[PDB]
Amino acid sequence: SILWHEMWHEGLEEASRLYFGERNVKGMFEVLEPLHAMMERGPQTLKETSFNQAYGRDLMEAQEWCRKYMKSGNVKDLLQAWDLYYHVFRRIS
Amino acid sequence: MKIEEGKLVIWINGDKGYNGLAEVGKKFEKDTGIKVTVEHPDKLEEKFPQVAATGDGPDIIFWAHDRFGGYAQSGLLAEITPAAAFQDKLYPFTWDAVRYNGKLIAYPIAVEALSLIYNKDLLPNPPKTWEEIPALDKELKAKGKSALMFNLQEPYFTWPLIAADGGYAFKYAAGKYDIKDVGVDNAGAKAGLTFLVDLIKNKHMNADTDYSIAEAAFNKGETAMTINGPWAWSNIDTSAVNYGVTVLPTFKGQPSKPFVGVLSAGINAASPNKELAKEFLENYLLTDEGLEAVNKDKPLGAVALKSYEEELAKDPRIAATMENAQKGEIMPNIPQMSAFWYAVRTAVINAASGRQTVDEALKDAQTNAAAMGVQVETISPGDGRTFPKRGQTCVVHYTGMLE
Amino acid sequence: GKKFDSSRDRNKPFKFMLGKQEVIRGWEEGVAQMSVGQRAKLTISPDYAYGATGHPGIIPPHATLVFDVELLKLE
Numbered sequence A: 001s002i003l004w005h006e007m008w009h010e011g012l013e014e015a016s017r018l019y020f021g022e023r024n025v026k027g028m029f030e031v032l033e034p035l036h037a038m039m040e041r042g043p044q045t046l047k048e049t050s051f052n053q054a055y056g057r058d059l060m061e062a063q064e065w066c067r068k069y070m071k072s073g074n075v076k077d078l079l080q081a082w083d084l085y086y087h088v089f090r091r092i093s
Numbered sequence B: 001m002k003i004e005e006g007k008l009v010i011w012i013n014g015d016k017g018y019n020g021l022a023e024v025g026k027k028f029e030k031d032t033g034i035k036v037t038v039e040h041p042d043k044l045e046e047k048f049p050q051v052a053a054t055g056d057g058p059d060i061i062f063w064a065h066d067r068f069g070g071y072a073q074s075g076l077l078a079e080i081t082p083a084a085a086f087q088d089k090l091y092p093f094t095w096d097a098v099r100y101n102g103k104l105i106a107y108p109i110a111v112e113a114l115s116l117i118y119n120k121d122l123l124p125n126p127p128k129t130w131e132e133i134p135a136l137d138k139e140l141k142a143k144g145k146s147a148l149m150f151n152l153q154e155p156y157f158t159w160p161l162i163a164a165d166g167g168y169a170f171k172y173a174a175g176k177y178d179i180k181d182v183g184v185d186n187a188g189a190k191a192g193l194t195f196l197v198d199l200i201k202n203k204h205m206n207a208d209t210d211y212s213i214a215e216a217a218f219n220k221g222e223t224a225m226t227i228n229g230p231w232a233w234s235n236i237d238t239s240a241v242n243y244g245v246t247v248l249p250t251f252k253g254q255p256s257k258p259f260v261g262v263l264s265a266g267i268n269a270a271s272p273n274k275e276l277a278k279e280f281l282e283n284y285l286l287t288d289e290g291l292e293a294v295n296k297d298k299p300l301g302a303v304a305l306k307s308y309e310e311e312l313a314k315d316p317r318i319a320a321t322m323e324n325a326q327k328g329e330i331m332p333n334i335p336q337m338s339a340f341w342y343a344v345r346t347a348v349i350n351a352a353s354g355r356q357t358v359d360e361a362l363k364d365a366q367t368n369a370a371a372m373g374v375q376v377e378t379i380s381p382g383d384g385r386t387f388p389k390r391g392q393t394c395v396v397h398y399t400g401m402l403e
Numbered sequence C: 001g002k003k004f005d006s007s008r009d010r011n012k013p014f015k016f017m018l019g020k021q022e023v024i025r026g027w028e029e030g031v032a033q034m035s036v037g038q039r040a041k042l043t044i045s046p047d048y049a050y051g052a053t054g055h056p057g058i059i060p061p062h063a064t065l066v067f068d069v070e071l072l073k074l075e
């Protein structure tokens, strides 16, 4: 009964607050990592499947930017991730 | 400890006499063994509140009294407690300039006012009006010279003209400043700034002229006139140019009203040497011999110390400065002076560069004069009746830049 | 000065909710006094921006920010 869009809405609401408000990049990845691994497992309900169709690629791309940031260390890649994260957040709100 | 104990660190603007102040510091060190260091960094009026916020500031700061109100409000200044006998040694009005919320926050050093400085050889009788300057420039262009060159970057120098016809920063009510009563877009200010822009249009002045450009021109005898404070005199003395200090030209039959600044020394609220700072300022700087040392380097203007002022007032240059000072008004020391000065700076620069019209520039400056945080510069107008409200979404395009 | 971010470089407009503490104080009050269609230049003091901490990698400490913003439409 607990939905994917509910969890992503709260997750981003928390991760953005941790990075932009607490300057905690490490703590941000702690809340984001499990949500991506959740998509990694795949959708099992109608709602989950519809969600994945809409935002799946965007969220997948966003994580690739986060990974790029870990290696490069350039906050530009991290911003590019948040551009994709913000796009899906506005749609689910 | 961020601030060193047993050492006095003093910040003063580089246009002032910092070497003379250092000679006073040497006398203090000679008598006490306390090292005094005089630094003159750029944009120190902006740097102080940055560093002093954490308590990493200098021991003493030197600026005109207008900044000090904002400093006092931020609690960056210690309340100075001079002895009643010492207070009587400085002119009472100078103490009023350094009082905020009924508490003294700084020591007044000297009273500054802009004056018309002219080459006596190029121009025996300087113009009594602004309006006759364009004709004089035109006449002087024939001899490969120019009439007037002054700093057009800082709004301290262009304020007399704006205030001449009745342009005011903040309206002075019942012994208190009303911050909601701005007069930067009034008819008087519009007229004054227009005449300034007119001069630049008709190629009487260049909009890209700064302090140093205008100083080089006059001191080399390329221009006939300049507008500058007492500090500049010592450069002109060595320039071998015969010069006089006189009252600023009138505009529309009204005297030019410059903002009057009192050079003031405040003690950092974070300084562990507050009692040492007090001793330096009271017993060393604010003395006949102390002020003279600073004066000999760069003239302070009309000093706050009564004894030494009675000597300086005999100098006609000082009398000329104090003539302009009377016609002008002593600056408010309210925190909004920061906002005001940057608002009038933008408007003057934009108008001179032709980026905006006089009416457009002063319209922006009107709402910016009390805007402490953010200041708006209109690039192109809107519908002027559709302002966003709390709860609504705003779709915008933007670009982020560092100054 | 140095451009650090632009929505025009993305081609996609930026949206935010006003008076909900979503953006810096410079925007919150600078945009609140802007009309629709207006393009304005917001000069934001550090105290209304990112302060002494700044934003590492993008924004240095005590950085005064300059924003060239056009308010397109309200939603």
Ligand SMILES: CO[C@H]1C[C@@H]2CC[C@@H](C)[C@@](O)(O2)C(=O)C(=O)N2CCCC[C@H]2C(=O)O[C@H]([C@H](C)C[C@@H]2CC[C@@H](O)[C@H](OC)C2)CC(=O)[C@H](C)/C=C(\C)[C@@H](O)[C@@H](OC)C(=O)[C@H](C)C[C@H](C)/C=C/C=C/C=C/1C
Pocket (backbone or CB within 6 Å): A012, A013, A014, A016, A017, A020, A021, A079, A080, A082, A083, A085, A086, A089, B398, B400, C004, C005, C014, C016, C021, C022, C023, C024, C027, C055, C058, C059
């Ligand atoms: C690549 O572009 C980035 C933003 C970058 C960051 C770095 C700076 C140089 C900059 O380039 O923007 C920049 O130009 C800038 O300084 N901006 C952006 C344009 C508006 C003014 C300013 C600003 O306030 O940024 C903001 C600044 C950096 C941080 C906030 C300042 C105000 C303060 O109250 C907040 O504490 C809470 C933190 C970023 C934003 O405007 C975004 C939209 C909003 C937030 C993150 C928070 O409000 C958050 O609260 C948890 C939310 O409610 C959101 C909707 C939750 C969702 C999931 C997250 C979205 C994240 C989007 C990120 C985006 C598009």
Ligand SMILES: OC[C@H]1O[C@H](O[C@H]2[C@H](O)[C@@H](O)[C@@H](O)O[C@@H]2CO)[C@H](O)[C@@H](O)[C@@H]1O
Pocket (backbone or CB within 6 Å): B013, B015, B045, B064, B065, B066, B067, B112, B154, B155, B156, B157, B229, B261, B341
């Ligand atoms: O230009 C605005 C500026 O004006 C005053 O600063 C004067 C100062 O009083 C003089 O002693 C001398 O240093 O020239 C300055 C102008 O460059 C205000 O005191 C200051 O707050 C303001 O920024």
